[PDB]
Design an enzyme around this catalytic site. Structure first.
Site, PDB file in Angstrom:
ATOM      1  N   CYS A   1       0.850  -1.223   0.000  1.00 47.55           N
ATOM      2  CA  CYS A   1       0.000   0.000   0.000  1.00 47.55           C
ATOM      3  C   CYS A   1       0.883   1.271   0.000  1.00 47.55           C
ATOM      4  O   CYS A   1       0.372   2.334   0.386  1.00 47.55           O
ATOM      5  CB  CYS A   1      -0.972  -0.078   1.178  1.00 47.55           C
ATOM      6  SG  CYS A   1      -1.478  -1.771   1.624  1.00 47.55           S
ATOM      7  N   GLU A 126       2.619  -4.394  -4.396  1.00 47.21           N
ATOM      8  CA  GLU A 126       2.882  -5.022  -3.075  1.00 47.21           C
ATOM      9  C   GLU A 126       4.117  -5.897  -3.232  1.00 47.21           C
ATOM     10  O   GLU A 126       4.274  -6.545  -4.299  1.00 47.21           O
ATOM     11  CB  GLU A 126       1.702  -5.868  -2.597  1.00 47.21           C
ATOM     12  CG  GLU A 126       0.633  -5.073  -1.877  1.00 47.21           C
ATOM     13  CD  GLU A 126      -0.462  -5.876  -1.179  1.00 47.21           C
ATOM     14  OE1 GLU A 126      -0.516  -7.117  -1.349  1.00 47.21           O
ATOM     15  OE2 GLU A 126      -1.262  -5.248  -0.435  1.00 47.21           O
TER      16      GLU A 126
END
Length: 258
Positions: A1, A126
């Site tokens: 994130c 990610e």
DNA sequence: CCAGACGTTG
DNA sequence: GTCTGG
DNA sequence: CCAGACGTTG
DNA sequence: GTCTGG
């Protein structure tokens, strides 16, 4: 994130944000600060990304279901911050945990003022921690898309933009300048589909109902808006080269299959 | 009452 | 600016 | 998020 | 080990 792609030319981005207000009027969101849109395959914190927010944040008496698109700084700078440069913030506001949002000084105040935004991206990255190696495996993660230089062009003409729940705040530099608009992306527990890649994922708003209710701080209370925040399985992904790792690398290789 | 924090990820 | 900790 | 710095003196 | 810069 902590990394996204948002590379589309501004007019292609804007057409991919075609929406309906509450009266069913097909609209394109209106820009603010279009000159700060900086398309890249590799968006890091402290860069600007385009986000959606209610027209009513900008225009008295607006229909709050009407949308504005504006570049905002990734890394929320709270209104109260006292230094002259926002990069001197000593706490990480890249992200904002769903579970604790109502008791975090930095996020609750702007949330209480209805500063809910939708962070746009092609998709996010990610890095998978793999047992017994320090080598991390990067993944590109995005909404399932529809089933040659003209082939690529049409994929991206038809691309479904990822829509992440954010909160933003407004900071006046003490020394004087433009109000800095800055955002955090809400994080939730990863869905099962993503659980082997990372235990966190962004709060993804899946379709125009969730986007609309998150944006519409007129007709949707914090409490009703927080019900939109949760994981989603409605997500696909593929592994990508180590090229993305360095944020200075801005090329289509960042999100190409390996 | 004031002083000091104010955040997330692994 | 507002909350927690002491 | 990762990559790369991480220090002082003149 | 931890912070800044991108």
């Amino acid at each position: 994130c902590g990394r996204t792609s948002c590379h589309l030319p501004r007019d292609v981005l804007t057409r991919a944000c075609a929406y309906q207000d509450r009266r069913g009027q097909q609209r394109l969101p209106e820009w603010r600060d279009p000159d700060k849109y900086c398309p890249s395959y590799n968006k890091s914190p402290q860069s600007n990304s385009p986000v959606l927010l209610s027209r009513l944040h900008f225009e008295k008496d607006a229909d709050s279901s009407e949308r504005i698109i504006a570049p905002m700084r990734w890394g929320l700078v709270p209104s109260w911050f006292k230094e002259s440069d926002p990069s001197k913030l000593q706490f990480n506001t890249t992200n904002c945990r769903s579970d604790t949002v109502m008791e975090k000084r930095s996020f609750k105040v702007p949330l209480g003022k209805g500063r809910r935004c939708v962070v746009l991206a092609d998709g996010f990255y990610e890095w998978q921690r793999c047992q017994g190696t320090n080598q991390r495996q990067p993944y590109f993660i995005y909404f399932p898309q529809i089933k040659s230089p003209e082939n690529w062009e049409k994929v991206w003409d038809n691309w479904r933009l990822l829509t992440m729940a954010g909160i933003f705040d407004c900071w006046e530099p003490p020394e004087g300048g433009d109000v800095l608009y800055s955002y955090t992306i809400i994080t939730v527990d990863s869905c099962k589909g993503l659980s082997d890649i990372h235990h966190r994922m962004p709060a993804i708003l899946d379709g125009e109902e969730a986007v609309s209710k998150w944006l519409d701080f007129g007709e949707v209370s914090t409490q009703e808006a927080l019900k939109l925040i949760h994981p989603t399985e409605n997500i696909t992904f593929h592994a990508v080269s180590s090229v993305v790792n360095n944020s200075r690398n801005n090329t289509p290789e960042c999100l190409a299959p390996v």
